[PDB]
């Protein structure tokens, strides 16, 4: 297994790449982490205070997360498929995205796009393609 | 890999067990499914119309989902840990639970308990123990 982690510090972008595992974090309170294998890809990008991006892939899966500001994006590409999650929050409106691809899911594709004032969440589970996009704006 | 799936039919409980993969569905519009390996355990239980329970485990992970009525519970125990999700909804208030355990998570434990009128979501990601409990009640 490869594992990667980048912790954002003031006025820095930090990159950690191990094999097929790419983590990138910008600014204080940003954390990107992942695990992957040969044949899989994990990409995690976090920007700004309260941003957490976690990408987990196995088999031939691609797990991609992008978290900005008060936001968590989690992608689990378990054995196969493309799990993509993008989440953007603001102070006092947290955006949470979760995408999973798994042979146990019922649907080939699941897409959730969510946008509004205050806390917002979007979750997708699919066999081939799980995609979540979440924006939380000021109440 | 083992895979299991149970589709609820009228006035029936349906059970499908393959190796360490246990799916149980009761009533029409209930679906439970999972994948697991030797050394892992997946348990998925769905009851009532609109209930979807999906349990994915690898390595030594335990993935447990329970979905009742207008509800989705998803547990991903990737390589290790105990991912447990319980979700209960009603007509026009959907409950969504997602729990993931993964070596790429930042925190050993993450617990989210969520209850209220209208749609409710809870997501947890952790290294060892991710637990979500969600109840959505009538607005």
- H and E: helices and strands count for chain A: 0, 13
The B-side interface with A (CB below 8 A) comprises 1, 3, 31, 33-35, 42, 52, 54-56, 58, 72, 74, 76, 78-79, 96, 98, 100, 102-106, 121, 123, 125
Q: B2-137 has which CATH code?
A: 2.150.10.20
- Strand B21-26 and strand B2-7: the pairing is unpaired
Q: Where are the domains of chain B?
A: 2-137
Provide the shortest C-alpha distance from residue A56 to chain B (in Å). Answer: 7
A27 C-beta neighbours (distance < 10 Å), count: 18
Nearest to B103 among A3, A100, A103 (CB): A3
CA angle (A11, A22, A72) in 5-degree steps: 70
- Partners of B125 on chain A (C-beta within 8 Å) are 54, 72, 74, 98
Q: How far apart are CA A129 and CA B100, in angstroms?
A: 18
Give one DSSP letter per residue of A45-112, joined into a string.
EEESTTEEEEEEE-TT-EEEEEEESSEEEEEEE-SSSEEEEEEE-BTTB-EEEEEEE-TT-S-SEEEE
Nearest to B102 among A54, A96, A121 (CB): A54
Resolution of the coordinates, Å: 2.0
- How far separated are the first and last CA of chain A, in Å rounded? 42
Q: Which residues lie below 8 Å from residue B46, measured CB to CB, with a gap of 6+?
A: B6, B8, B24, B25, B26, B30, B31, B32, B52, B53, B65, B66, B67, B68
What is the signed CA dihedral for B84, B90, B91, B93, rounded to 10 degrees? Answer: -70
- How far separated are the first and last CA of chain B, in Å rounded? 42
Q: How far apart are CA B75 and CA A115, in angstroms?
A: 25
Q: Which residues lie below 8 Å from residue B114, measured CB to CB, with a gap of 6+?
A: B120, B121, B122, B132, B133, B134, B135
Nearest to B106 among A33, A55, A100 (CB): A33
* HSE-CB of A93 using CA atoms within 13 angstroms: 15
What is the signed CA dihedral for A104, A109, A113, A114, rounded to 10 degrees? Answer: -20
Q: Which residues lie below 8 Å from residue B113, measured CB to CB, with a gap of 6+?
A: B122, B132, B133
Q: How far apart are CA B135 and CA B89, in angstroms?
A: 6
Contact B36, B15 (CB under 8 A): no
Solved with: X-ray
* Chain B, nearest residue to A99 by Cα: B98
Q: Which residues lie below 8 Å from residue B23, measured CB to CB, with a gap of 6+?
A: B4, B5, B6, B15, B16, B17, B32, B33, B34, B44, B53, B55
- Partners of B56 on chain A (C-beta within 8 Å) are 76, 78, 100, 102-104
Within B58-108, residue ranges assigned H as helices are none
Look at the block and give the residue holding tokens 């910008």.
A26
Positions of E strands within chain B: 2-7, 13-18, 21-26, 30-36, 41-47, 51-57, 62-68, 71-77, 82-88, 95-101, 109-117, 120-126, 129-137
Q: How far apart are CA B45 and CA B30, in angstroms?
A: 9
Q: How far apart are CA B119 and CA A80, in angstroms?
A: 30
Contact A48, A67 (CB under 8 A): no
Q: Is A66 exposed, middle or buried (0-12, 13-18, 19+ CB in 10 A)?
A: buried
Please judge whether B103 and A1 are an interchain contact, meaning their C-beta atoms are less than 8 angstroms apart: yes
């Amino acid at each position: 297994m490869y594992s990667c982690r980048a912790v954002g510090v003031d006025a820095s972008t930090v990159t950690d790449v191990q094999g097929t595992c790419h983590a990138k974090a910008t600014g204080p309170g940003a954390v990107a982490s992942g695990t992957s294998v040969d044949g899989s890809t994990s990409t995690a990008t976090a920007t700004g205070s309260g941003a957490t991006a976690t990408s987990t892939s196995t088999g031939t899966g691609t797990a991609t997360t992008t978290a900005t500001s008060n936001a968590a994006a989690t992608s689990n590409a378990i054995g196969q498929g493309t799990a993509t999650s993008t989440a953007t929050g603001t102070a006092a409106a947290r955006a949470i995205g979760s995408s999973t691809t798994s042979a146990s899911a019922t649907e080939p594709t699941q897409t959730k796009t969510v946008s509004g004032p205050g806390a917002q969440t979007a979750t997708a589970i699919a066999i081939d393609t799980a995609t979540t996009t979440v924006t939380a704006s000021l109440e």
